[PDB]
Amino acid sequence: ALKEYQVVGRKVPTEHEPVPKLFRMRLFAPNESVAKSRYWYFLKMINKVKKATGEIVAINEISEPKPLKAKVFGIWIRYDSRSGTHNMYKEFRDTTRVGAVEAMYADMAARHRARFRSIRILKVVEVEKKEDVRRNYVKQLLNPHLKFPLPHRRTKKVFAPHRPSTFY
Amino acid sequence: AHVQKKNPLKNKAVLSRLNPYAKAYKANVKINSEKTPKAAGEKFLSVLHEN
Amino acid sequence: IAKRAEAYEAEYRAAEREQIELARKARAEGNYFVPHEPKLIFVVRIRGIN
């Protein structure tokens, strides 16, 4: 049950650094506690700020501003492989930014056997222009001629008397 | 003394033994429907709906 | 004891109201409010004696 949590944090003020800078980023975490722990690890990678050296100031979840309108989302991700250094960027069409994020995690966990710790969300953006779309499958989902039969029909009440029609 | 353990939550009579306040609580209180002052900083919304 | 229960409930409800009002104001004028660090946690043992 992922949800997009905004995290703002800063280092502990002291006589050397009376006013710390405000660092804010949007990350997808299933709960507040996961979000805060991920934020600290990200800051250690980038700014090298320890948990004791700093403190979180505000945590807030972001709903989809237009959850009822279909959109296309492009995410840039760096993934750890046998070499431990890989980068990818993917596009998905979904009605919720979290829905896009959890969709990519499943795809990463299937194609590359990707773990939550290994994956780091680099960039999130909204795809709106038709020419911006690059992947072939979403391109097929973009043209107005989208029409096809329902795939994977297959539709305890065991021992059904008649043969199933399995048609229209 | 205290042959059995009776739950203060489950048993209302033991609650009166331990809580000489449970007689008057009225836990639910109407603290709304009074022209609610929607509180949200405009710049807070701007930084919320970014990237 | 009954009166001390009145004061405690009033203290608890005021504390919750103050904290909620504290965050509403900060969100209203844009400043960020960090809540006070808790002093009480409840620990639960999860691993046996082996």
């Binding site: 405000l22 969300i121 | - | 844009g30």
Partner: peptide, 18 residues
């Protein structure tokens, strides 16, 4: 509990380095 100010210290977005 202390009000952390934001004047002249607006939050800055950071994203992981590729």
């Amino acid at each position: 509990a202390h009000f952390v100010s934001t004047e002249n210290n607006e939050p800055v977005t950071l994203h992981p380095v590729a």
